[PDB]
Design a protein around this ligand. Structure first.
Ligand SMILES: Cc1ncc(C[n+]2csc(CCOP(=O)(O)OP(=O)(O)O)c2C)c(N)n1
Ligand SMILES: Cc1ncc(C[n+]2csc(CCOP(=O)(O)OP(=O)(O)O)c2C)c(N)n1
Ligand SMILES: C=C(O[C@H]1C=CC=C(C(=O)O)[C@@H]1O)C(=O)O
Ligand SMILES: [Mg+2]
Ligand SMILES: [Mg+2]
Ligand SMILES: [Mg+2]
Lengths: 535, 543, 543
């Protein structure tokens, strides 16, 4: 067995032992050793392989596969700009703390600077965006060194997995795993792979760390909880008035609408996760006089407030909220919900806010909701969606528009896969995505799934199409006019154009499909004005 | 505002430096130099191109630079901009493309405490750019305006010189930061001159070479023109300029025993070229411009910039090379005619026969750039572009679009309204799907008048049929992981972007190309890769 | 007041609230970041400032000040050579996890990248070595935003401190903190509290371990204290804290067959240790704090932070280890007694016997740190320091000086009358010559009160006598390129710098150390390395 084939099979086996259930693969020749070993593992049923053509959107597919079920996910590609194309997903995975392993094949490092084809400064390309930049050695033809090389290869693979899942740091994120490879790149004619640990165990076992930092907080002070992306679950704060972003997990049943917050005067703030969504949240955390307490699941804590008194992972609570304060916040929340609902009905034309409210009402527990990181996530929060029992995904790391379609497809695939391991047909759970037309058009090639590749069993993408100071904004002066139906036809995906009233019934009833709901953009500044005035 | 004055000085000096096109993307904050660029665009001193896709924007800028050889600016204005521009910047480094990346830091804001909307840095700027220059923050000091104007225009000329290789002969990408505090132009030199003028430079490294020794010339990407080598048998890549009129077909090379090799530029094509270059019994002389020389095996005897020649090739050696060249040409022509199914090689031959002088030819990676060489294209009189720096299949649509725009722009300024010269791109289907978003161009934005993109579509990566993983013993496992079939409806995709497109057979390709159409159009030719490996085998057996 | 002046004190006040007691500065072309605010706090006794001319020794002085009492230390860059000269100290701070804050001041109103930079001339190591890189904004003249700026500045300074001390990461290390400049101090928290408080954190990773299996504990740099492991036979490096009472000598390890290993922290010494850790039939469990784990061989079975033990070591196993422990120690001492020439090993044992609880011991690399382990030093009650992060022989003099000052300062604020506790440094002769400039301390500058530097001078590098290049077959060539004799007059060297020094024999050492002297003194013991390979051979024969 030639060295490239031996090394690739060892790495793939150790990744599987580490909990990697899904791998994204992009075509090339230099990554052939990885592609062969990955195809074997898929044939054996040890992993599910997903082949894609465009490395950039393939990275967001891997992000979706990771956030859908919480497992580390590898994306593998050839040397050169294929690696550079993972840049956007790596940045998103860094700030959203997604265990994304970039498994890049490379020419031998000795060829760097020789003019060799398709070769570049690959290792270190991602800078400080990755949790680690790790290189295997070039595989030596040293059969007597086989046992030693098996240990070092599997150990390096375990270092990669630990860094990506945050097993020791509690700060999951992307990892660059560069593997220099040389000829022969394809397996030899048959006419054994060095084995891992017994019982399928990982070569170096590192259990998931428990990161703990308790913090004293007195709940008698009029307190509001603001929870953002990556927030933990705190039972002892469940009673408090909580402004929760759609991707934050709910700890209780005392919601406070984001619009209600600037109309109240909290005397202290408990901040969970990384809240970046709302402008009244940004405004209040900008107020240097309001003391803030930051509770995070990991060592990072957000910089959105300059008055963070302390950090922790959990609250040690004394006291209890004033009943008058609870009554006041509850009243203002009811008031904000009513204002939004009244103005929506009093608005004749369909807006993206209407589409978002319709999608919000159509959801039922067990659904997974994937939200475009710009308008959809804001609109759903404006419509006051109740996320309890719903799994809400959104690329809130840097909130780019790249890869939103691929992230939805990947999250559905991973979510449906976690259902299969339960044991049951009761049918696979629903994944519903809400994406704007510009985001959808930009990542429409994320729809492309080859005839041989896994297709989501129950994914519906709702496209809210409203047809779209510096000079670059002239691009928005005109509706783009892109035919969404033609786009879906191009990538052989079923699509239907429907009205908002039809959306709920149609979501009740194709595999993967796109439902396009036309909406109007002109009348919205007035609609938001009406909502604000009705508060 | 001092920052508005500084921005106007910089744009003016960039225009004096030959910048004709700037690429922008809508962003989290305003673009660097945003208003000065808008002022210049309205005046017609410069031309702005706006895109939503930041990755395709980078490759658009590369095309705008290689189309006519001018420095091009791209202004990065978002938290994903550095990540998305990576591919184009790397290609600009390795293909030596004068690409100026504009940024606008905010010295009054914090850095390193969290996500940065203005710039999220990766690690490639340290390795890829020729220079990283930051202007000062512009201060209000009316009494120092002459000194500041001199400082700003001097630094701008440094950015331009580093990007174009004015003094280094090593063009490449440059990072140019004009910082901002958020939230009559001092003149330049008389007669539109650049503030700091860089007159022509020569790097001279002559090498003594005896041409009576049986010699072949291999000319790759970035090769120079050597009149004293014009008589030699020459295996020229499509992007190499031709010194002479003695072509040697790539497939004829293994049928020969060269005694020495002159290597011009950077070779990226053909395993027989790589084998010959590594042969320790064959002296190799590398003639290239710039700091580094290509030598994968380490076998090269000497490197320089030009040859001082004695002797001449033996007529028998020239006859032998001409005879094997004839065999190779005949084998390709005869086996293509004998082959029933249309392949990408068929499409490449059709494109080659249809070109004429003045055409610009843009070649995608994979089989197209190789197939054009196998079809024996005569590149004299035409300009051939291809992103051979890293040979990516990403961004080729915007590269072709940018190349057409810059090429048409240079022609309009000559002043003869003969119709704009043609740009014809030949790319594979995977290459097309990779960069299909480059077809999305707003009516506000410049659009080519004479660009035709030929997509040879064999529903996958045909080159992998020709490699070791294309051997029949991998036939059960190779379709998914190397073939990567996709079943995309190309006509529908072009419909969605409102781009004229036709699906035609290889015989109609020539006539359809002879007759113009919309400013941009996509001609799709269905092709087969199932017979590809056999076809190349039949060609080799006919040599 | 100038906004920069306000910002500078806000930062210095928050640094002092963060436990910074010492700051190291060097004279540069530009004055130091926060220079006046540091001057103010020095005069008021809020911090102690240390000035050095040598920028390299200044960085290692800062490391000593940090490891002496565990406090974060700031070092202010001021020149065009500071980055390069601080490199070695930053790399050691990274690998030894030392909280070192590197202060810089970029000037955003000036140009960058056109050449010519006088306050930070960058290298490539900052990206790889630091825990964070933070830049305050430029101070902006907006008195209506005074309270908001105060919060932003104190919040960012706490980020810097938390990253340096590992307050939330348990991964202390160096941090780059830039306060940019341009050519009634707002209050912090009440009661001297830091602006952002970080309560204690725990990283918990329990591993099930069966102590009935024959287990040896090996503890290296950065090892934790594990009570449930105190009974096990333990080979503890000198800088490792002892969890218990059952020592196992390093030389006994080859005479034993552990069936599993518990590794604490990072082992760097002893080939038998490395051999055992790499044994594929021996399960290895790594218990260490922080993001990474040591495993050169890739052999380790599991990593974590603590053990969940079942069972107890077999009495037969315990007795065998105790037996070979006693045997190993006896062999070292008998062979040292039999040996007729003073070697570094003799000096190590002498210093070892002279130590008493409350002492601080600073060990150079090479033979000193190893010899002390071979002399069986019982480190309980002793603070042992050594630059094991990357194990350079550079900067050890200033590390000891800084560690002494921090240790004496910590003792002083207990307020006690009691002689400031002792710091005893044991370093080789090359190590001493390497960092001899660390002796040069201005009368203005803080100077230790209880520091004795013992130099075991064998006129070269003794450790090479014990390696493969020490084999007699290399005798003709090995002295020049490995021994590197220098013939320096060490007494004249200390006299040039006005430092007390005595050249004494090894019998005098214990008595001389027992007796107090000048604040800083050097005792030099001449040693022989010609017989060192033989002596080590004699010790192993006695096993
Ligand atoms: C960004 C990038 N990803 C992957 C590759 C590897 N690669 C080289 S050729 C090729 C096949 C391209 O297929 P197509 O464009 O259809 O051309 P064909 O060979 O089929 O004519 C691939 C995936 C690359 N060069 N660049
Ligand atoms: C800066 C640096 N240079 C070189 C080395 C390599 N090195 C390791 S031990 C050693 C010899 C040290 O000699 P000495 O300080 O006299 O101690 P001895 O072993 O002689 O007791 C050298 C040069 C190093 N560790 N650091
Ligand atoms: C041209 C060859 O492979 C190239 C073409 C496609 C994919 C490649 C890759 O991804 O490594 C190779 O660069 C060859 O080996 O002859
Ligand atoms: Mg829209
Ligand atoms: Mg193809
Ligand atoms: Mg010595």
């Amino acid at each position: 067995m030639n060295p490239s084939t031996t090394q690739a099979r060892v790495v793939v086996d150790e990744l599987i032992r580490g909990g990697v259930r899904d791998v994204v693969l992009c075509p090339g020749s230099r990554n052939a050793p990885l592609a062969f070993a990955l195809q074997d593992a898929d044939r054996s049923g040890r992993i599910r392989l997903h082949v894609r053509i465009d490395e950039r959107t393939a990275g967001y597919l891997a992000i979706g596969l990771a956030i859908g079920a919480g497992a580390p996910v590898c994306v593998a590609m050839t040397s050169g700009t294929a690696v550079a194309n993972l840049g956007p997903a790596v940045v998103e995975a860094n700030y959203a703390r997604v265990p994304l392993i970039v498994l890049s094949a490379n020419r031998p490092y000795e060829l760097l600077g020789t003019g060799a084809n398709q070769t570049m400064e690959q290792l270190g390309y991602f800078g400080t965006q990755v949790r680690a930049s790790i290189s295997l050695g070039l595989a030596e033809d040293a059969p007597e060194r086989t046992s030693a090389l098996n240990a070092t290869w599997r150990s390096a693979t375990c270092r990669v997995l630990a860094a990506a899942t945050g097993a020791r740091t509690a700060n999951a994120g992307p990892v660059h795993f560069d593997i220099p490879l040389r000829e022969p790149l394809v397996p030899d004619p048959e006419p054994v792979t060095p084995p891992g640990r017994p019982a399928g165990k990982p070569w170096t076992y590192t259990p998931p760390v428990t990161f703990d930092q308790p913090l004293d907080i007195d709940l008698s002070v009029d307190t509001v909880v603001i929870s953002g992306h990556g927030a933990g679950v705190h039972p002892n704060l469940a009673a408090l008035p909580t402004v929760a972003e759609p991707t934050a997990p709910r700890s209780g049943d005392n919601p406070l609408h984001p619009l209600a917050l600037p109309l109240l005067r909290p005397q202290q703030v408990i901040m969970l996760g990384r809240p970046t969504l709302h402008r009244p949240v940004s405004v209040l955390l900008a107020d240097a006089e309001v003391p803030v307490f930051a509770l995070t699941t990991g060592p990072r804590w957000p910089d959105v407030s300059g008055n963070s008194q302390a950090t922790g992972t959990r609250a040690v609570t004394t006291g209890a909220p004033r009943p008058a304060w609870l009554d006041r916040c509850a009243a203002m929340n009811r008031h904000a919900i009513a204002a939004v609902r009244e103005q929506l009905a009093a608005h004749p034309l369909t807006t993206g806010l209407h589409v978002a409210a319709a999608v919000s009402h159509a959801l039922r527990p067990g659904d997974q909701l994937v939200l475009g990181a710009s308008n959809p996530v804001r609109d759903v929060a404006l419509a006051g969606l109740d996320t309890r029992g719903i799994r809400v995904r959104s690329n809130r790391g840097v909130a780019g528009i790249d890869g939103t379609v691929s992230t939805a497809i990947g999250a559905a695939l991973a979510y449906e896969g976690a259902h299969e391991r339960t044991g049951s047909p009761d049918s696979p759970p629903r994944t519903i995505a809400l994406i704007g037309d510009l985001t959808f058009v930009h990542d429409s090639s994320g729809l492309l799934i080859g005839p041989t590749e896994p297709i989501p069993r129950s994914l519906t993408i709702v496209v809210s199409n409203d047809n779209g100071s510096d000079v670059s904004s002239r691009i928005f002066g005109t509706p783009h006019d892109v035919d969404v139906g033609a786009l879906c036809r191009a990538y052989h995906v079923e699509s239907r154009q429907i009205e908002v009233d039809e959306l709920g019934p149609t979501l009740d009833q194709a595999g993967m499909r796109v439902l396009e709901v036309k909406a109007d953009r002109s009348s919205l500044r007035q609609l938001h004005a009406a909502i604000k005035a009705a508060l």
